[PDB]
Write a protein that binds this ligand. Sequence first.
Ligand code: HEC
Ligand code: HEC
Ligand code: HEC
Ligand code: HEC
Ligand code: HEC
Ligand code: HEC
Ligand SMILES: [Cl-]
Ligand SMILES: [Cl-]
Ligand SMILES: [Cl-]
Ligand SMILES: [Cl-]
Ligand SMILES: [Cl-]
Ligand SMILES: [Cl-]
Ligand SMILES: [Cl-]
Ligand SMILES: [Cl-]
Ligand SMILES: [Cl-]
Ligand SMILES: [Zn+2]
Ligand SMILES: [Zn+2]
Ligand SMILES: [Zn+2]
Ligand SMILES: [Zn+2]
Ligand SMILES: [Zn+2]
Ligand SMILES: [Zn+2]
Ligand SMILES: [Zn+2]
Ligand SMILES: [Zn+2]
Ligand SMILES: [Zn+2]
Ligand SMILES: [Zn+2]
Ligand SMILES: [Zn+2]
Ligand SMILES: [Zn+2]
Ligand SMILES: [Zn+2]
Ligand SMILES: [Zn+2]
Ligand SMILES: [Zn+2]
Ligand SMILES: [Zn+2]
Ligand SMILES: [Zn+2]
Ligand SMILES: [Zn+2]
Ligand SMILES: [Zn+2]
Ligand SMILES: [Zn+2]
Ligand SMILES: [Zn+2]
Ligand SMILES: [Zn+2]
Ligand SMILES: [Zn+2]
Lengths: 84, 84, 84, 84, 84, 84
Amino acid sequence: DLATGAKVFSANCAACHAGGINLVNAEKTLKKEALEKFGMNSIVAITTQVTNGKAGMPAFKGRLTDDQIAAVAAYVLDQAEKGW
Amino acid sequence: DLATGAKVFSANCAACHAGGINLVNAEKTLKKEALEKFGMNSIVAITTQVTNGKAGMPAFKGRLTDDQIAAVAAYVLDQAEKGW
Amino acid sequence: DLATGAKVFSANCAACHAGGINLVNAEKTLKKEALEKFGMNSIVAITTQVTNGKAGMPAFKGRLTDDQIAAVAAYVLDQAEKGW
Amino acid sequence: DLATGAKVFSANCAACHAGGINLVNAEKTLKKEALEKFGMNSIVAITTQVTNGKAGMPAFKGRLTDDQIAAVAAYVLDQAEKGW
Amino acid sequence: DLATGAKVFSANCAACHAGGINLVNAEKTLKKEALEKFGMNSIVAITTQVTNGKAGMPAFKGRLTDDQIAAVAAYVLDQAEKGW
Amino acid sequence: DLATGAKVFSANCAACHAGGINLVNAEKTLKKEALEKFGMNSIVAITTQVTNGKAGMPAFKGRLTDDQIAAVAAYVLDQAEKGW
Ligand code: HEC
Ligand code: HEC
Ligand code: HEC
Ligand code: HEC
Ligand code: HEC
Ligand code: HEC
Ligand SMILES: [Cl-]
Ligand SMILES: [Cl-]
Ligand SMILES: [Cl-]
Ligand SMILES: [Cl-]
Ligand SMILES: [Cl-]
Ligand SMILES: [Cl-]
Ligand SMILES: [Cl-]
Ligand SMILES: [Cl-]
Ligand SMILES: [Cl-]
Ligand SMILES: [Zn+2]
Ligand SMILES: [Zn+2]
Ligand SMILES: [Zn+2]
Ligand SMILES: [Zn+2]
Ligand SMILES: [Zn+2]
Ligand SMILES: [Zn+2]
Ligand SMILES: [Zn+2]
Ligand SMILES: [Zn+2]
Ligand SMILES: [Zn+2]
Ligand SMILES: [Zn+2]
Ligand SMILES: [Zn+2]
Ligand SMILES: [Zn+2]
Ligand SMILES: [Zn+2]
Ligand SMILES: [Zn+2]
Ligand SMILES: [Zn+2]
Ligand SMILES: [Zn+2]
Ligand SMILES: [Zn+2]
Ligand SMILES: [Zn+2]
Ligand SMILES: [Zn+2]
Ligand SMILES: [Zn+2]
Ligand SMILES: [Zn+2]
Ligand SMILES: [Zn+2]
Ligand SMILES: [Zn+2]
């Protein structure tokens, strides 16, 4: 759910995406407008990138359960709307 | 207008000012409060800096039409109020 | 008060915490959610860190009066709620 | 030559690559090892990217002469070798 | 060895430490002087931190083999000595 | 001397200049070439800026003794020469 995404995000994502930014590839933020722009505004899109990684973003298949992954894709999606 | 500023901003400004920050000179953000503080909160101020550049900010006279420049100064001004 | 925190923040804090970020230790932002997470969401917590510093954050005992310190802890607390 | 190279770099490239870094896409530095790793360790490789751009890196076609681009590409390779 | 070290670093560490920097916690670089200053100038020191993680640095236990971690620790020390 | 210089730098300057970088204003690094380019390659130039501050760089007057500032200026010049 939502409170478990907030916890998973704090443990695995905050280093690079603190408060919705992207320290590694600056334009590829977690902001709503950016998520729309790169077509990552979806639970499908996020859950697959988190799984297989992409460029500087690591893969999280192996250490996140696809229940925690679905939940953190959803936390991302919820703060983006609120925005951050 | 507004939708053409969103496009121009994505193509020319997002590298340094992704989501209203400034990666090059940290305090000189595009946030409302910062725009007021440095007296850049105006279409005049923005359109002239974009044209002639300033320190690490390049000049965009030559590659942006002063119709695209006026529009992106306005996109900046619209996200700042909404804020970002 | 509030307008004097805005001035003190601009003079002493904006270099590292421009618009609520943290350029030095990325996750330790001034955002509401981060302030809660690290237990810095309080005038007590902020006023003591500002005074004694902590890791890369300097101490401001000596150059900020504990009237300016109380006020800037409060500016931080006010933009965090508004958020930034 | 490297002196015109050095002047072009200072005026156009140092905002995002100061000292051989990459502020926008952190792994794509101007250090010799990254230039080798991404296949950008040649005049032609560099001249092509500077001319046309790639992602957050601007196109310099029509802003810099071909001689300026050649010179800046040479300067990058030279600085990389010396260790910036 | 340093070649497997170099490949592991590229694939897992360059996102936050490209060129010996630290994007997340700026003072904790991979430069020889910072490694000495924070007591991280040994294989065992580095292997332990890579394995278990610390704050914003991820744990690599179970993601990288012990041999890969050993090799990456060796590569870090070697690059530090050469000056990245 | 450089040992007191090294201790002062670690305690006061590494937050924004770790390894010779400039986290706040990216082009104004402590590398020898940038120090030359901005006319900051002298003890007097550095002691003056450290003492009085400039823009996002804090004033250290009254926080550091004149001897500490002298020593840190010497250390900067020395590290620049060695290549940080
Ligand atoms: C923790 C599990 C997460 C979550 C939920 C996200 N990230 Fe990252 N991220 C990083 C980089 C370099 C990119 C760009 C990759 C590329 O070039 O395409 C991303 C991208 C994303 C997105 C898409 C954003 C967009 O605007 O397109 C999303 C939704 C996302 N991430 C979520 C870098 C890192 C890290 C640095 C080592 C870490 C850790 C994470 N990401 C972890 C996570
Ligand atoms: C695309 C055309 C744009 C737009 C619309 C803006 N920028 Fe930049 N910017 C950069 C730097 C280093 C500064 C500070 C300059 C200085 O020292 O005075 C700025 C400043 C601005 C402002 C004013 C912000 C303020 O708070 O005062 C504005 C409104 C602005 N910019 C808009 C850096 C860069 C880039 C890095 C290479 C790029 C690309 C751009 N800017 C592009 C744009
Ligand atoms: C001006 C007087 C201020 C104010 C009001 C704040 N800061 Fe900083 N800050 C810096 C660093 C490296 C940290 C992390 C320290 C650590 O490792 O614990 C912080 C932390 C904070 C907090 C807590 C944030 C949190 O989410 O826990 C707060 C409320 C805060 N600061 C306010 C770095 C710097 C600087 C770089 C040199 C400067 C200047 C300042 N801080 C100044 C201020
Ligand atoms: C001024 C004329 C220059 C020069 C000589 C170079 N750049 Fe950049 N750069 C930027 C980004 C985001 C990238 C990555 C692009 C991508 O996604 O692939 C680059 C890349 C380079 C390279 C290749 C480096 C590598 O390791 O592969 C080189 C040689 C290079 N650039 C030279 C970002 C920016 C800017 C920010 C807005 C600016 C300004 C420049 N680059 C300008 C220049
Ligand atoms: C890939 C396998 C690696 C390797 C070899 C290293 N890292 Fe990192 N790192 C990160 C952060 C936030 C820190 C500071 C942690 C803290 O608070 O103490 C570190 C620290 C290090 C060190 C010690 C450096 C020092 O000067 O003390 C070393 C040797 C090291 N790391 C090696 C952040 C990140 C990442 C961002 C999400 C990633 C990815 C890595 N580290 C990965 C690696
Ligand atoms: C600790 C005592 C130090 C020392 C020795 C130096 N700094 Fe900084 N610095 C900061 C910023 C924003 C600038 C640019 C200021 C401007 O707009 O002109 C600087 C600049 C310097 C220089 C000149 C470098 C050059 O290439 O011109 C030097 C020698 C220097 N500093 C030394 C930012 C910061 C900080 C962030 C809040 C802190 C802390 C320091 N500086 C501290 C120190
Ligand atoms: Cl440079
Ligand atoms: Cl430099
Ligand atoms: Cl590399
Ligand atoms: Cl690297
Ligand atoms: Cl590199
Ligand atoms: Cl150090
Ligand atoms: Cl340092
Ligand atoms: Cl260092
Ligand atoms: Cl330079
Ligand atoms: Zn947060
Ligand atoms: Zn990018
Ligand atoms: Zn928020
Ligand atoms: Zn955006
Ligand atoms: Zn940032
Ligand atoms: Zn500044
Ligand atoms: Zn937004
Ligand atoms: Zn602000
Ligand atoms: Zn951290
Ligand atoms: Zn705001
Ligand atoms: Zn330089
Ligand atoms: Zn990258
Ligand atoms: Zn020609
Ligand atoms: Zn050098
Ligand atoms: Zn490298
Ligand atoms: Zn630190
Ligand atoms: Zn084994
Ligand atoms: Zn090197
Ligand atoms: Zn150092
Ligand atoms: Zn950096
Ligand atoms: Zn600058
Ligand atoms: Zn004295
Ligand atoms: Zn060194």
